[PDB]
């Protein structure tokens, strides 16, 4: 029948989708949430063997074991256990586009399990067991008689096994087909890989039992008041004796509970649904839920007979709270949300695709701990923790239907087509009917780049029909169609628009004010984190505060999809597409996350728990404005303590409890600051510390900060002139300067400081020269290629310019003496091929204290593409363990990314100053720098610096981290300017305007000495 | 132009149109007749179908017609004539002046279904003067509102041709037979003969 | 697989559903809407036989004709032939409401059809077979290959048979069976055939 080359066909015999089962037979349990002796996991050890193709499986392995087997771990992707390669592509597909067929080479992972059963479970009741998520289709067996078959990775299939068992041993057959018409709908933009990768497991069910129930809850105007209703449904034989209770319990108080036998409404002319039953229950002053105080009450649901008898009883977590649209604004509980969302594909660099709850809580843990309130399931129905974790801690869920055909031309052709609806509409109602008692769930999605059709219209209505208490999201198709109750682009930027026939991406600013427009908006994908990314970050964040029908959105994304492969020692290594050799491939493409796969964070996480802070800050006089964004909590765990420091050093510094209402604003009123004696430049620097810990983060959690120049004393007082003179020793080739115990070299041919000395040591491996390039970010490559390159890359510009091949012309050099210091001018010409690209004229001022003031000023011709930097480097001979500045930091921060850093003392080893991007780039730059301290060395001025054992050219031409090699001595770049890194996306220039280097002319000044 | 789908039998009416694993089926009903006869001009309205209450299935495919061709209106009667899934109120036999408030899905009279608070859309039954033998009595009555009422335009009488079937006795002489003529049971006897024309076209 | 016991399944290697056509190869002919040489009738004297149930329907009749069967006009109803009994109710279902199973006894209509087909046809484009009509759900097979699957009763089902057919004389098959899946969905108020 070849099933899987059949969008016709996507299951057989599986049975109806519901909410999480349990089958207690002890009320208490039910309430309590306890383990279930009704559902038992086959997760563990099972047996597996790998074929080229199902023709290739031996009818023998549906009646016994194959000697060839493996004993493997399940769940598991069998490609994590080297079977076959992991497949990375974005957008074209894995397999051939010809629809609804899959190559004849479909690899088939057969896996089998021989368990026991007892008795009791056969002698009644109904047993089925539940494969949570099998990739990408299968056939299952048991004792060798065909059972089923199924579709959609990432949702359950539950077959029914209660004639296909017996009591004792048993062995179970799945054949795990990798590609199948299935797969024309799973063309997300992650790792293609398949097999049982989710848990399985065997629920026991009595014959008359609770198939289904949904839980709603109302509430009047003010929310004081709210009505829970329940409606339950039964199968099996109905008997006028059979009852259904359901109960509210908060905490071990039971606050409400009603009961009546089976028979609903009328519903029309034949009369009602006589196997269902809707309670409803009064709730007085119902305990809200938020992701800012997720309150939870517990609903159990038991079937039971009118004397008391227990039959079965199920139950869940129930949040009271509303969500809905209302004049353009998308409101919980009545209040406008701000979402400041991140989307979270399921990966682990070991696992591949397998989730386990420790990781799930460690990624929600620091979401929550980097002000994160929401996350979007991309692309498709999560493991079924997830929900249970998030309506626990408390976020904000965008449930979306695992549908992506991004990969069809035009991306709508199956969308569109009448042929594909019922596979799509499974998709999405078995969804709906798995999910809709989560509270954490607030919006549905009708999946992912897949166009925008008729079948997305038809699905969007259905889910308004039987969920009108969650609206319905769909980026597809320009973002904002009549499919979609949110406009929700992807990338649209803040200001500018880019015009794309058809589905244009507008300014977001500007789509909300289109003629007849009047929808929210929150992009589902925005701020494209590939590796050194996020700038610009701040600009979306200004926009949403502004702008109230700018609610947020999810930041693409939370974690890298980078894979763990070994070197010959064993050494594990962060490995992409193509490392598998897997192709074709999109390289590093699929690492795009704010933390490494291992979860360590990015430099980018901090700017984004920056922006996405809880309060406000503003500063007048002695007065400090602390607004509250929360819209239900009261500022109960916080505490701000303010400092305020002389150029790092601190002069006074307190804390103030914060009692701030949601929503509103506490003034803080600063002591007499008593006025600094030296000069400099006086620091405000507020934060808010949480005293207490939370179920998600530990006492002294900071949760947001903010700084402030205050007063400024220039420095007028003049140097004691030391009574020392340098002295200038001309020669041929060089010019050389002695002091004391100090000595500098200048090569007359290059025009360039060549070497330094403090003693009979060189301070240099290579010469202090001018540098206009940087080895290039994610977002300077874009998707440009050897064998396909983007002329329009700024990478790809800065080459064609000559800007990496530029030679240095030297155009003068000259010496003078002074009073009491030597003077050293030059002035070169960047040339490729006859263009001047570049002029840099400099002076060398070296004065009796040993000081050397460099003076930089560049020309930079208009017509040239603007350049990555201005500035200067060098390979220093000293290797020191700290490096010590002050200016912005801890952390890497760049033009546009460093609202986050902080201006101060900073001191760290120098390991911490290198950013191990998995894809090797610039990075770990710090600006705002006024004093720099490494070795012996200080640099002195105002300028931006990254110091590492790695070469801008190593890391240019290395693919991987871990083929870096330390090189001799440290490089060290500074620079007086540097460009943006942008990120808004990363296939096209994002870095905008205002951080472009295209002044033409600039000017920086550093002063060079030894400690 | 009506989709062949109607589950008049099931209890209650939309328990099949309201679950989802009946959707697809559901959906080729509707999708393949749009496909086949979207070119006709003579087609003006489409149809979800008939007496099936009203599901969610209704909903969807509502949609998907209201997307896929805006040239048309469309109209569906379960669930009350008046639902979600319906461009027109399209009620079964709701008289001209007396209302008939059944539970769940009342057929009120059709003046004043029209002017409910909040409706604003036509009114054309799909069914009405059911002519089962002697009928049609109060025809007239319909009439004369259709011409007050602007909004009341018309409807669809039940209906043209007696579903009467021939069969033949000794004398090898045809005679028209119904319900349960044919040894067919359970039937529903003479309820098959509701025209104005006998099943020769002879009229009544 | 008895795919008239499942809803999921409506089809097996049907064509999609399109507005109707005769490929002219002439515009003029088109144009005033004459008869096109490219669209044929199979109208006419087919081959019938009368089971109580797939079942007992033996194989042999893929392959070739039924000496039992009786010849008789198609397009037609078997019970305006007499084969079994039309039945007449309104709202109650004709079979008992157990969805989406259907009575064992499942009264089945055999149909086969002996026909000619031009080898111009074969030496080029594709030759498609078309049911406008068919209650309420069938199999098809020709020249003893199956072809496909179909339901939905009011409504055109067709199917490639370029690959099955040969020039000259070809074997249609067709088993349509009285109840489906799909006569949940056909409980309108008429005589029941
Ligand atoms: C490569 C672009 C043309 S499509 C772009 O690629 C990104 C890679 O992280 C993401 O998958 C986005 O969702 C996708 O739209
Ligand atoms: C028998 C009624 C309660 S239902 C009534 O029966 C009529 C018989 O001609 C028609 O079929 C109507 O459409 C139907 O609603
Ligand atoms: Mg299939
Ligand atoms: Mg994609
Ligand atoms: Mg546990
Ligand atoms: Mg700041
Ligand atoms: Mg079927
Ligand atoms: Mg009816
Ligand atoms: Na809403
Ligand atoms: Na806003
Ligand atoms: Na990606
Ligand atoms: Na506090
Ligand atoms: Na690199
Ligand atoms: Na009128
Ligand atoms: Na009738």
Request: proline share 6%.
């Amino acid at each position: 029948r070849r099933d899987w080359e059949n969008p016709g066909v996507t299951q057989l015999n599986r049975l109806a989708a519901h909410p999480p089962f349990a089958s207690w037979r002890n009320s208490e349990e039910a309430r309590t949430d306890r383990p279930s002796q009704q559902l038992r996991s086959l997760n563990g050890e099972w047996r597996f063997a790998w074929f080229p193709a199902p023709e290739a499986v031996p009818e023998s392995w549906l009646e016994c074991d194959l000697p060839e087997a493996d004993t493997v771990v399940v769940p598991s992707n069998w490609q994590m256990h080297g079977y076959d390669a992991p497949i990375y592509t974005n957008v074209t597909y894995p397999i051939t586009v010809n629809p609804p067929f899959v190559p004849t080479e479909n690899p088939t992972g057969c896996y089998s399990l021989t368990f026991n059963v007892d008795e009791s479970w056969l002698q009644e009741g109904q047993t089925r067991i539940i494969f949570d998520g099998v990739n990408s289709a299968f056939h299952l067996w048991c004792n060798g008689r065909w059972v089923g078959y199924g579709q959609d990775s990432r949702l359950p299939s539950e077959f029914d096994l209660s004639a296909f068992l017996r009591a004792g041993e048993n062995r179970l057959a799945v054949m795990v087909l990798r590609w199948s018409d299935g797969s024309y709908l799973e063309d997300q933009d992650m790792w293609r890989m398949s097999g049982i990768f989710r848990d399985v497991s065997l629920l026991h069910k009595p014959t008359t039992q609770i198939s289904d129930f949904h839980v709603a809850t109302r509430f009047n105007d003010d929310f004081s008041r709210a009505v829970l209703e329940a409606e339950v449904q039964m199968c099996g034989e109905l008997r006028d004796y059979l009852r259904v209770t359901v109960s509210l319990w908060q905490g071990e108080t039971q606050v409400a509970s009603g009961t009546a036998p089976f028979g609903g409404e009328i519903i029309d002319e034949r009369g009602g649904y006589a196997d269902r039953v809707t309670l409803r229950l009064n709730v007085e002053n119902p305990k809200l839920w938020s992701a800012e105080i997720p309150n939870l009450y517990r609903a159990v649901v038991e079937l039971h007979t009118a004397d008391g008898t227990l039959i079965e009883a199920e139950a869940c977590d129930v949040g009271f709270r509303e969500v809905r649209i209302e004049n353009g604004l998308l409101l919980l509980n009545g209040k406008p949300l701000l979402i400041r969302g991140v989307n979270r594909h399921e990966h682990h660099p070991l696992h591949g695709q397998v989730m386990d709850e420790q990781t799930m809580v460690q990624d929600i843990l620091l979401m929550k701990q980097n002000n994160f309130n929401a996350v979007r399931c991309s692309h498709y129905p999560n493991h079924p923790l997830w929900y249970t974790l998030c309506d626990r801690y408390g976020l904000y869920v965008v449930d979306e239907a695992n549908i992506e055909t991004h990969g069809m031309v035009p991306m709508n052709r199956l969308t569109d087509d009448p042929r594909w609806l019922p596979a799509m509409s499974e998709r999405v109602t078995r969804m709906v009917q798995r999910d809709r008692n989560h509270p954490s769930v607030i919006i549905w999605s009708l999946g992912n780049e897949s166009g925008h059709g008729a079948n997305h219209d038809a699905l969007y209505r259905w889910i308004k029909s039987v969920d009108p208490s969650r609206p319905v999201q769909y980026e597809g198709g320009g973002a904002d169609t009549t499919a979609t109750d949110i406009i929700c682009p992807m990338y649209a930027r803040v200001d500018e628009d880019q015009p794309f026939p058809a589905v244009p991406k507008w300014s977001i600013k500007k789509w909300l004010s289109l003629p007849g427009e009047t929808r929210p908006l929150i992009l589902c994908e925005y701020a494209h984190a590939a590796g050194n990314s996020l700038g610009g970050f701040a600009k979306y964040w200004q926009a949403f505060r502004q702008y109230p029908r700018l609610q947020g959105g999810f930041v693409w994304d939370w974690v890298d999809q980078s894979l763990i492969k070994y070197d010959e020692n064993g050494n594990p290594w962060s490995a992409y597409g193509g490392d598998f050799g897997d192709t074709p491939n999109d390289r590093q493409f699929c690492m795009n996350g704010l933390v490494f796969a291992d979860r360590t964070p990015h430099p980018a996480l901090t700017e984004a728990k920056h922006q996405q802070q809880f309060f406000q800050f503003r500063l007048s006089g002695q007065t400090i404005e602390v607004t509250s964004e929360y819209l239900f909590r009261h500022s109960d765990n916080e505490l701000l303590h303010w400092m305020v420091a002389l150029d790092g050093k601190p002069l006074a510094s307190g804390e103030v409890p914060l009692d701030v209402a949601p929503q509103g604003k506490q003034l803080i009123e600063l002591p007499e600051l008593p006025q600094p004696e030296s000069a400099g430049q006086l620091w405000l620097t507020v934060r808010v510390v949480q005293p207490n810990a939370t179920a998600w983060s530990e006492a002294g959690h900071i949760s947001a900060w903010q700084q402030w120049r205050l007063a400024e004393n220039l420095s007028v007082t003049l140097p004691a002139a030391s009574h020392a003179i340098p002295h200038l020793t001309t020669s041929e080739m060089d010019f050389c300067i002695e002091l004391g115990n100090k000595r500098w070299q200048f090569n007359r041919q290059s025009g360039f400081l060549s070497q330094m000395w403090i003693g009979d040591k060189k301070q240099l491996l290579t010469p202090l020269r001018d540098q206009f390039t940087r080895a290039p970010l994610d977002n300077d490559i874009g998707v440009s290629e050897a064998t396909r390159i983007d002329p329009n890359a700024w990478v790809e510009r800065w080459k064609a310019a000559g800007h990496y091949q530029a030679e240095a012309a030297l155009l003068q050099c000259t010496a003078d003496t002074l009073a009491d210091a030597v003077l050293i001018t030059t002035a070169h010409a960047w040339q490729h091929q006859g263009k001047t690209l570049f002029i840099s004229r400099k002076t060398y001022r070296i004065d009796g204290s040993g000081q050397m003031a460099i003076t930089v000023d560049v020309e930079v011709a208009s017509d040239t593409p603007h350049p990555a930097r201005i500035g200067l480097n060098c390979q220093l001979a000293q290797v020191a363990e700290r490096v010590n500045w002050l200016g912005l930091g801890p952390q890497e921060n760049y033009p546009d990314r460093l609202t986050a850093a902080c201006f101060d003392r900073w001191d760290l080893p120098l390991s911490d100053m290198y950013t191990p991007y998995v894809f090797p780039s610039e990075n770990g730059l710090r600006c705002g720098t006024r004093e720099l301290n490494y070795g012996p060395h200080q640099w002195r001025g105002d300028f931006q610096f990254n110091i590492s054992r790695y070469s801008q050219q190593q890391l240019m031409e290395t693919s991987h981290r871990h083929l870096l090699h330390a090189e001799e001595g440290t490089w060290l770049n500074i620079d007086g300017f540097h460009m943006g890194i942008g990120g808004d996306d990363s296939w096209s220039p994002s870095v905008s305007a205002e951080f472009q280097l295209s002044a033409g002319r600039y000017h920086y000044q550093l002063v060079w000495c030894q400690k």
